[PDB]
């Protein structure tokens with residue numbers, strides 16, 4: 001049974017939504033977002049209306065990708081989907097897609113700049129990031145864009161990962177936080193990357209919680225690489241062999257060699273167990289970084305680790321990513337996922 005919809009103009013946009021959603025108010029603008037009160041669940045929610053979801057094959061496939069990913073994520077430390085709807089009554093009139101999640105308050109940016117964090121706060125915050133990442137990586141999903149603005153935190157220090165990587169050249173240029181948390185092998189297209197890029201990001205975030213300062217605030221790609229290599233050392237021949245670009249290999253060998261620094265003299269006064277974990281995350285060779293599952297068992301988290309309460313995900317079929325389809329075929333696949341949605345308990 002289809003709910004009754006009502007229409008209203010929010011700023012310059014017509015919004016048509018089920019009656020359950022009340023008191024819509026614009027808060028942000030890929031799509032515009034409104035806060036609302038969900039009278040069925042009692043929650044304050046975010047409602048996102050996608051902008052031109054099927055205007056090109058690239059756009060239509062991205063719409064399908066985002067919906068498939070949000071429908072799969074069912075974990076305490078990851079954003080999940082409360083609802084998805086369209087006012088269309090058939091595939092023939094299908095044009096608009098609306099996504100509904102819990103409304104997030106502050107992000108980790110607010111916290112790190114405004115609050116005095118104890119070591120216990122850092123333990124709990126990083127533990128929750130790693131617990132969510134163990135789940136995400138168990139489905140062979142790579143987040144690719146972990147940074148403080150994509151981590152939501154509440155008054156009780158509880159955390160959720162948001163805004164999966166689903167970014168342009170201009171967005172990554174210059175003195176910008178959009179690049180400061182990226183692993184060097186993806187920042188410079190050294191090689192085919194994998195899920196280890198997310199652990200580099202966690203290391204950069206953890207360092208910033210401990211010091212209150214950005215770890216690698218580069219003014220451009222090359223300045224940032226120089227900051228990275230000064231801390232962790234220039235690469236040895238083993239890693240150089242793995243850099244597929246001969247151009248990038250050539251540039252690396254133009255730099256004078258540098259040893260890895262002493263992290264206890266960089267992170268002055270930090271818990272020695274926190275220093276140890278940072279040395280295992282911030283490794284230049286991605287093959288040798290600690291994994292999320294291994295990091296949860298590190299002694300730094302002894303207060304919180306429970307191997308019977310760190311779940312893995314159901315399998316996630318990503319075969320669509322190598323599939324070539326027409327706009328109307330991606331649109332039909334998206335329609336099927338809208339109408340098959342089953343809400344959480």
Ligand SMILES: COc1ccc(N2C[C@@H](C(=O)N(C)OC)CC2=O)cc1
Pocket residue numbers: 027028029033046047048079099100101102103104105162163
């Ligand atoms: C400041 O302006 C905004 C305020 C909130 C939000 N969002 C987006 C929500 C989400 O992850 N989905 C995909 O959107 C339904 C979660 C959330 O709180 C976005 C902008």
Ligand SMILES: [Cl-]
Pocket residue numbers: 003004018019020021
């Ligand atoms: Cl309703």
Ligand SMILES: [Cl-]
Pocket residue numbers: 078079080081102160
């Ligand atoms: Cl959620």
Ligand SMILES: [Cl-]
Pocket residue numbers: 086087088093094095096097
């Ligand atoms: Cl529609």
Ligand SMILES: [Cl-]
Pocket residue numbers: 109147148149150177
């Ligand atoms: Cl950020």
Ligand SMILES: [Cl-]
Pocket residue numbers: 315316317318
């Ligand atoms: Cl699947």
Ligand SMILES: [Mg+2]
Pocket residue numbers: 149150163
């Ligand atoms: Mg974001």
